Amino acid sequence: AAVKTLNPKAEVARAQAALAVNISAARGLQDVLRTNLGPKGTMKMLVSGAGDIKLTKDGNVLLHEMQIQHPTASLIAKVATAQDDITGDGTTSNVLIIGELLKQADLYISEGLHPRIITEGFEAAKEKALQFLEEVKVSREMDRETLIDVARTSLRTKVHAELADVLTEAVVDSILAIKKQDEPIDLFMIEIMEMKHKSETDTSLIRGLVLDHGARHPDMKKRVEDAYILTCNVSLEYEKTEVNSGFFYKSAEEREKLVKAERKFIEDRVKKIIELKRKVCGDSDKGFVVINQKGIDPFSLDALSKEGIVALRRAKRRNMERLTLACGGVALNSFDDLSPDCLGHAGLVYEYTLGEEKFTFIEKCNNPRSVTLLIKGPNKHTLTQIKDAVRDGLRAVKNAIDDGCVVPGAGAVEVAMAEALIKHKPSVKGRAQLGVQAFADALLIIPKVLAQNSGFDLQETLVKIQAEHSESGQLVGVDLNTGEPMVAAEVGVWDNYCVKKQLLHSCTVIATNILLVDEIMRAGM
Amino acid sequence: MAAVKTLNPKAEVARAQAALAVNISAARGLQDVLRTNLGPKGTMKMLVSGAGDIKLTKDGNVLLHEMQIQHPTASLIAKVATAQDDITGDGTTSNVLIIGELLKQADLYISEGLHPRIITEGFEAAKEKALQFLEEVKVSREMDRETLIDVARTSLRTKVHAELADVLTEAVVDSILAIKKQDEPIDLFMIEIMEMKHKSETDTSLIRGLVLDHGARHPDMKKRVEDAYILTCNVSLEYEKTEVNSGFFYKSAEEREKLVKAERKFIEDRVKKIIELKRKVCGDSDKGFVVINQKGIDPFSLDALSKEGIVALRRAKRRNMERLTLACGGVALNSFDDLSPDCLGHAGLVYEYTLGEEKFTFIEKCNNPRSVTLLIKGPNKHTLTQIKDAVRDGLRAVKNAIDDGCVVPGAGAVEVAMAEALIKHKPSVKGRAQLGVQAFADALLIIPKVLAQNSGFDLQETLVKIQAEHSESGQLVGVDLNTGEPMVAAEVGVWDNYCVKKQLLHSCTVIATNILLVDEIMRAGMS
Amino acid sequence: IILAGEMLSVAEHFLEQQMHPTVVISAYRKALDDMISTLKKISIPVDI
Amino acid sequence: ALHVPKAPGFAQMLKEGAKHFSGLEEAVYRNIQACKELAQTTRTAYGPNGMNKMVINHLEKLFVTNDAATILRELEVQHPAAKMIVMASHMQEQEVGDGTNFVLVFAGALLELAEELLRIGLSVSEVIEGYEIACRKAHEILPNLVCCSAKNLRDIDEVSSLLRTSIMSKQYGNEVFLAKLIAQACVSIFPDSGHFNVDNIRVCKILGSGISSSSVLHGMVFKKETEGDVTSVKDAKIAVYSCPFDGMITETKGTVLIKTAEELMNFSKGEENLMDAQVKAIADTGANVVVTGGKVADMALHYANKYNIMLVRLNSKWDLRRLCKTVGATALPRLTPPVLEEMGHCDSVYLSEVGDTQVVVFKHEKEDGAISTIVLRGSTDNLMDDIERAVDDGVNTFKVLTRDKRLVPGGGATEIELAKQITSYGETCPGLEQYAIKKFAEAFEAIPRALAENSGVKANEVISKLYAVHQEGNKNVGLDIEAEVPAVKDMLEAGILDTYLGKYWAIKLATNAAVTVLRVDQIIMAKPAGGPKPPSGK
Numbered sequence A: 001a002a003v004k005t006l007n008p009k010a011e012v013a014r015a016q017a018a019l020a021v022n023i024s025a026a027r028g029l030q031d032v033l034r035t036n037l038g039p040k041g042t043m044k045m046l047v048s049g050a051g052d053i054k055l056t057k058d059g060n061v062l063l064h065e066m067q068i069q070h071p072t073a074s075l076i077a078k079v080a081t082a083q084d085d086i087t088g089d090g091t092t093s094n095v096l097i098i099g100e101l102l103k104q105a106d107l108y109i110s111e112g113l114h115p116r117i118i119t120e121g122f123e124a125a126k127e128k129a130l131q132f133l134e135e136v137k138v139s140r141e142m143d144r145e146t147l148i149d150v151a152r153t154s155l156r157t158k159v160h161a162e163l164a165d166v167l168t169e170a171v172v173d174s175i176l177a178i179k180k181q182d183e184p185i186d187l188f189m190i191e192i193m194e195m196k197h198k199s200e201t202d203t204s205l206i207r208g209l210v211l212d213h214g215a216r217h218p219d220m221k222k223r224v225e226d227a228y229i230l231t232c233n234v235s236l237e238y239e240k241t242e243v244n245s246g247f248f249y250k251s252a253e254e255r256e257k258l259v260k261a262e263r264k265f266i267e268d269r270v271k272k273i274i275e276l277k278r279k280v281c282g283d284s285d286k287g288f289v290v291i292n293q294k295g296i297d298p299f300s301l302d303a304l305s306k307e308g309i310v311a312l313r314r315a316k317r318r319n320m321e322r323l324t325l326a327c328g329g330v331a332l333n334s335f336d337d338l339s340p341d342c343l344g345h346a347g348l349v350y351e352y353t354l355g356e357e358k359f360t361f362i363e364k365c366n367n368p369r370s371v372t373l374l375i376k377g378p379n380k381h382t383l384t385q386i387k388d389a390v391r392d393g394l395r396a397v398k399n400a401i402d403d404g405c406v407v408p409g410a411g412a413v414e415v416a417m418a419e420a421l422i423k424h425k426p427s428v429k430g431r432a433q434l435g436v437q438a439f440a441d442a443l444l445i446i447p448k449v450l451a452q453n454s455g456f457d458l459q460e461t462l463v464k465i466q467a468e469h470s471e472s473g474q475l476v477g478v479d480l481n482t483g484e485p486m487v488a489a490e491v492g493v494w495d496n497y498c499v500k501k502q503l504l505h506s507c508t509v510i511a512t513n514i515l516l517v518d519e520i521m522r523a524g525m
Numbered sequence B: 001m002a003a004v005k006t007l008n009p010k011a012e013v014a015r016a017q018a019a020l021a022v023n024i025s026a027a028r029g030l031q032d033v034l035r036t037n038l039g040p041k042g043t044m045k046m047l048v049s050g051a052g053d054i055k056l057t058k059d060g061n062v063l064l065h066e067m068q069i070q071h072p073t074a075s076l077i078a079k080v081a082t083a084q085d086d087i088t089g090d091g092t093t094s095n096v097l098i099i100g101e102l103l104k105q106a107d108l109y110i111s112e113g114l115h116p117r118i119i120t121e122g123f124e125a126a127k128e129k130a131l132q133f134l135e136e137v138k139v140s141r142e143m144d145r146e147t148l149i150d151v152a153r154t155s156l157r158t159k160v161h162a163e164l165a166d167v168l169t170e171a172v173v174d175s176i177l178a179i180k181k182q183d184e185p186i187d188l189f190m191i192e193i194m195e196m197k198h199k200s201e202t203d204t205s206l207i208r209g210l211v212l213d214h215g216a217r218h219p220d221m222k223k224r225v226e227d228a229y230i231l232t233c234n235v236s237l238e239y240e241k242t243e244v245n246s247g248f249f250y251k252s253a254e255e256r257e258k259l260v261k262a263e264r265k266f267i268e269d270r271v272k273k274i275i276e277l278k279r280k281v282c283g284d285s286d287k288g289f290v291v292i293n294q295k296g297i298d299p300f301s302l303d304a305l306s307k308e309g310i311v312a313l314r315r316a317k318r319r320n321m322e323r324l325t326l327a328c329g330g331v332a333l334n335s336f337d338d339l340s341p342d343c344l345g346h347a348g349l350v351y352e353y354t355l356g357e358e359k360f361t362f363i364e365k366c367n368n369p370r371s372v373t374l375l376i377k378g379p380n381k382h383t384l385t386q387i388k389d390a391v392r393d394g395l396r397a398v399k400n401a402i403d404d405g406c407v408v409p410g411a412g413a414v415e416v417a418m419a420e421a422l423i424k425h426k427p428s429v430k431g432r433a434q435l436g437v438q439a440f441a442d443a444l445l446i447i448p449k450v451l452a453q454n455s456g457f458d459l460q461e462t463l464v465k466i467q468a469e470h471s472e473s474g475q476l477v478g479v480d481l482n483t484g485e486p487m488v489a490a491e492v493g494v495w496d497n498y499c500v501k502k503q504l505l506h507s508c509t510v511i512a513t514n515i516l517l518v519d520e521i522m523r524a525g526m527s
Numbered sequence C: 001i002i003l004a005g006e007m008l009s010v011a012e013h014f015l016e017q018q019m020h021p022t023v024v025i026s027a028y029r030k031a032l033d034d035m036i037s038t039l040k041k042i043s044i045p046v047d048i
Numbered sequence D: 001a002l003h004v005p006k007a008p009g010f011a012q013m014l015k016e017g018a019k020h021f022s023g024l025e026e027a028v029y030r031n032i033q034a035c036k037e038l039a040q041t042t043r044t045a046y047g048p049n050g051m052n053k054m055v056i057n058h059l060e061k062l063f064v065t066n067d068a069a070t071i072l073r074e075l076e077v078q079h080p081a082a083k084m085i086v087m088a089s090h091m092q093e094q095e096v097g098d099g100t101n102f103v104l105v106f107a108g109a110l111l112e113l114a115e116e117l118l119r120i121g122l123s124v125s126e127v128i129e130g131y132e133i134a135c136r137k138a139h140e141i142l143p144n145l146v147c148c149s150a151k152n153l154r155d156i157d158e159v160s161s162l163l164r165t166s167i168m169s170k171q172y173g174n175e176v177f178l179a180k181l182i183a184q185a186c187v188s189i190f191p192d193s194g195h196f197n198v199d200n201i202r203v204c205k206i207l208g209s210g211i212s213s214s215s216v217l218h219g220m221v222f223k224k225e226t227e228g229d230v231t232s233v234k235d236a237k238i239a240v241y242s243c244p245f246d247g248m249i250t251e252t253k254g255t256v257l258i259k260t261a262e263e264l265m266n267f268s269k270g271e272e273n274l275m276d277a278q279v280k281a282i283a284d285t286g287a288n289v290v291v292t293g294g295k296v297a298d299m300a301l302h303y304a305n306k307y308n309i310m311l312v313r314l315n316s317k318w319d320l321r322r323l324c325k326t327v328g329a330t331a332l333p334r335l336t337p338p339v340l341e342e343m344g345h346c347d348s349v350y351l352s353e354v355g356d357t358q359v360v361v362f363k364h365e366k367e368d369g370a371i372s373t374i375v376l377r378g379s380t381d382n383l384m385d386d387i388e389r390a391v392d393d394g395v396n397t398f399k400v401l402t403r404d405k406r407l408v409p410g411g412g413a414t415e416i417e418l419a420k421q422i423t424s425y426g427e428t429c430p431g432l433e434q435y436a437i438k439k440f441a442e443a444f445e446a447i448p449r450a451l452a453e454n455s456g457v458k459a460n461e462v463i464s465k466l467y468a469v470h471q472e473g474n475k476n477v478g479l480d481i482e483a484e485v486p487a488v489k490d491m492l493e494a495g496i497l498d499t500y501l502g503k504y505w506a507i508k509l510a511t512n513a514a515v516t517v518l519r520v521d522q523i524i525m526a527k528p529a530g531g532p533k534p535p536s537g538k
């Protein structure tokens, strides 16, 4: 090797060795991630070095938690990470399609064909496939039923059937709650709070907020029926002077006067809050809740509790906007001019205690633009799995809402797109028809893996589905219970159009780039 | 993890798909190494041993033995190729390529969930059909010198340079025709392969006689005998100790002299028997005697023989007894109890050739030798070894061709025809074994692929051209290694041994079936 | 080998409970006698 | 031909220390074996005849107990499936407080029978669905097995009878005394409002006199001593301060600036006069006892001693809050005299010595109060810790009874009846799930079997007799541990009862843990790191 002559302690894989290494790594990743695809997939166990336990079948989580030290594996992991970051779904299909593309390309490369022709065929097939995907998408009015169908199609593949059924309603209701007409959906306005005291089926949607902290004063009321919410970002604790003030006295009486007069600055703001509370509610019927992003010293807590005011300190920064949108008040950075119009309203505020941790509920809002999903489970790994599932479901529903189109699932679009590619292959000039055929065969991996996970045989199910599609022309997928061809649109198995487009683009790009790699070098030492 | 590892903690186990993947990877690696060997357009490989010895070769078996491989599946394939070389003498590289391609094509369908058993059933059905087609396509023919020359060329051209191959063709064909008895098996032991290291590689030739790597020890002994009587004997003419621990007892110096003189009487009796025979046979100095002895001759007997103008050799090889009796025509003797001129061989010329330190003896101009020698000449040791391997392969090819009168067209034509026949026969196979039949046909198609690839042409374009020509015309068209166009191997003169093809099919199918059915590799013999 | 493993498994089942191994061994021997009797009963002759 | 290389792909790409287990034999059977082994380890402590176990953690701390949750907590469990089982047990302990050993036994039996079903040919999904169906059927059946209810909780005798069974499994020899103690302590707590707080029951462990001398006190006991000279008060008027008993200082920086001789000569005298005035102002309200959460100054202590004020210093703020709840006072943030509403009243505060330790007792006389304290005697620290665990179990049982008042027969009667009816239901269900349902029913037998094994009788005879009696129609018949031969008796008359919520939650959590373990098909374990604990655990 030329490189080894300059750097003796350098590792080099060149010519067919680079292709062999890359394809072997891709095939290993594909073999690991085959069993994830579909609701009939196998659940995986990931034990960390510290002993933590994670149960998942998510492609991205599995890739990040596999003990792998391979370069091509890192490349595919980054591709899947981008897939998860943008669309939130399709990482397992991403890895499967990349691996199958590389394998089908190798099938022709090993017979003396140059990878450039395969890449040209890949680009032509990708263009035709994108055109077919545009042709086959189903534009629909995203009512509640379609969103429920999409959420089911995601969650059933992510979690248990009954848990998925509950999470469908939760996710769809939350998304419909936070969604403004003709406006991008902000997923930051859905707080994912997890509790660890009941069953997994107890996960629900609260039309309000749940805060992981409670009142720090024992005498504060534990339950307020009609509450005025004051979302503020004002420090209510003692603060040092920025210019190294210091005190100087000549007697104990002077020390007492200085002690009493050093709290006046905070006491003025506390008195402003108390005066506003008295003005707004002159009776004991209504309640007053103060949620502060900064700390509150015990003296201010006592002064507030003397007036029957519940005060929560050190709230999260996002909670300012969340409470502003849900309760309807306004976050305040000062009390220079505060009026009854700056106060939010909540129809019920109460505190919940779970072991050492305490939680505060804010429900019965008028029209909460920000809501929260409360994850409940007996184990930490159950909570993590449900969090991953609800993230996937929220991404799926948001994607479905974003563009009024949706694609039939169960691998039907893969089969139809492969058939269209086969039909279009003669129009491609040159030997790029081999690349087109390889792309179609790689696209056909999804029904194959679904048949494997459902327990059937690849060839029989695939030929049955392809024959049904050719004879009828409909979009027929894989029936995971019977193995017969089935129309995915009729049963309500929907896939995100953006997810499919991203899959095609990313898989084709990474496969083309990997196939053109002829040397792997490690000579930076 | 596994049961075996639980019982034996330091046990290495590859189970389920892992074993199949390991075996297929090893076979593919061996095939990738041995692709470049196939065909006359192959490339020399230089193999350096631990001691630093340099070996130049393209032989598949020779390359396999010198490959630095420690893999189980590689060991299995190497043993199969070793048997192939031992029995037929050709087809080792083709053996490895066909095994590897069979495994690859089988894995192509196995990775799609198909069970290996169905592939093996398809393999056996396709093997039966291919054997039937091979019986159909062979060319039965009475084989004169021309066909043997063509076969020897088809072997040696793929083993050595074109000019050296052309010389070796005449050498091997003439030797085989020389030792070949009518309707009798050919004894390849009767062709001595002798090496000297003084001339160019093209100076190797055939001697219609015998060449011995040793000469006469007594310097006064004659160097060149024109007309020679050959005496082949297995009698020790050196001093022999008594078996029963005799020992000598004397009382005076004169008695010691008498005992010393008397103790050589036994050997002197044999020596004088030889001398009397020589004097009786030839009373003049025109003729001469050459005495080849398998056992040693002490200097006293050598001097006594040299006094009578007799040339004699000691410590000859065991096979040389039969070689001389078949070449010169004498009788090998284990004792001189009753020896007659009827037991003396004949040779029209005997001379001694000196090459550096070592000596050589030439026995030539025999009446009608049934045992000849092949004299390998070259400037290097590795050149001599390469020529020796090439001559062995050519001898095996010619002998196999002589054995069964049929012969098979080469250049991969028979592979293509068998693949097409298997494709046509595929619908007659019931079940999913049609996939195995297709895999077997594709594996058989590897030979034209590798030939075209080594010649530098496009693999797929050349293959489809050959297949289209064969389908349209129906002839047996191979791969032309100069142009890439289809060519009729039968008319050009590229012939393959029928037995080699049959053994290739049988061995490759058997080993592929056995490997495909392995689901666990275990090494738990330690402790 | 498979039969020995299976019998030892079904014996472990009882050993987990409060049954002494001697009772299991006696039951196994009686069962073996009956097994031999049944095999001899269901056999058929052969014309060599 | 002397080595087996790693298969290309994932096998070679794995890290040096990682482990990958895939497939039935490599993953599911190993997990089932680990869970079965854990259940075997914890089995022998089940029931009243359970045996204590000495468990020594990595810090050489003794733990002699028959509490399954404590044993698992002190055990360094490493197998992750056993980790799920332990987490399920701990969740059961958190939710209810009793039934952890039931969770272990049921999960182990379920996983053993799941392994059997997988061996005979059933798939994992079929076993899981059968287990879930059988769990639903068991939860449907369970309310129909309720025999009696608490029907009152302000009483002492019947509350003690209810709590006897919960603390009969532990401290089997003497449970009536503990039942009476815990019943009195809980009845003091739990006012007219239905809310019952477990933390309102305090346990004080004083060594020396044997557990038979333990008592219940309507107040709080602190293992401290009075700071001042006064050591006994008969009509305490406690004033509680969260600030140190000293003149407060500026929070920024204190610097006594002296510019004349008169200021230097008068500063200390004026400070002392101010301290005296503050202490006398506090005393003039009638507060004869002062409790502070910070340090006590020397001059403040002197002036408190001058006015006959009893001083107690409590370092823990939790203790301060609990004392405020007990006496009814408000922890003042400053050293101002307390108004009449903020001053707490306790009928007696005094310094006493129990055994060796000096204690300060805030003692009431009414049979009421916010917080009640149980003083525990004994001859060993470990014995008192075990008694404390038993008291915790009894208090949790009382809290559960406040939540739900329904009870089911104990001693395996409920388990046997559940097994019988689940088997009857599964005999009618067609399909392959009948095997899983029947195995789920059979898994209930592990409870009476464990009880019989620990008691020292033949389990099979007891189970057969239980089936015979339950077939006769007696749903309240369980194992009689007061016999040397296999015998059964009605458990309603015996008063051996278990909380409905405990059984419900234990069954639910055990089934969930079993099916979660069964769901795992592949395991990928990283190399065990040598890090000094995760940063989350500090």
Ligand SMILES: Nc1ncnc2c1ncn2[C@@H]1O[C@H](COP(=O)(O)OP(=O)(O)O)[C@@H](O)[C@H]1O
Pocket: A036, A037, A038, A039, A058, A059, A089, A090, A091, A092, A093, A094, A153, A154, A156, A157, A408, A409, A410, A411, A446, A450, A477, A478, A479, A480, A493, A495
């Ligand atoms: N109920 C169903 N029936 C048939 N096919 C389904 C069903 N649910 C999902 N699928 C198909 O299985 C695939 C699930 O892939 P998934 O496990 O979600 O991978 P990823 O998380 O990477 O998207 C989808 O492409 C979908 O087409």
Ligand SMILES: Nc1ncnc2c1ncn2[C@@H]1O[C@H](COP(=O)(O)OP(=O)(O)O)[C@@H](O)[C@H]1O
Pocket: B037, B038, B039, B040, B059, B060, B090, B091, B092, B093, B094, B095, B154, B155, B157, B158, B409, B410, B411, B412, B451, B478, B479, B480, B481, B494, B496
């Ligand atoms: N001159 C030629 N033209 C075309 N094909 C040839 C020629 N010579 C040999 N071949 C083909 O190439 C192959 C040579 O294989 P070879 O290298 O001898 O393998 P092995 O040494 O294992 O027998 C033969 O099968 C023959 O059919």
Ligand SMILES: Nc1ncnc2c1ncn2[C@@H]1O[C@H](COP(=O)(O)OP(=O)(O)O)[C@@H](O)[C@H]1O
Pocket: D045, D046, D047, D048, D050, D068, D098, D099, D100, D101, D102, D103, D165, D168, D169, D170, D409, D410, D411, D412, D451, D479, D480, D481, D496, D498
């Ligand atoms: N006097 C008794 N006779 C028979 N069985 C009893 C008696 N007291 C309790 N039990 C049984 O013992 C079991 C309690 O076991 P225990 O050691 O408390 O485990 P856990 O703490 O997990 O409940 C209950 O199921 C109950 O049926």
Ligand SMILES: [Mg+2]
Pocket: A089, A090, A091, A154, A157, A392
């Ligand atoms: Mg998905």
Ligand SMILES: [Mg+2]
Pocket: B090, B091, B092, B155, B158
């Ligand atoms: Mg050859």
Ligand SMILES: [Mg+2]
Pocket: D098, D099, D100, D166, D169, D393
């Ligand atoms: Mg208990």
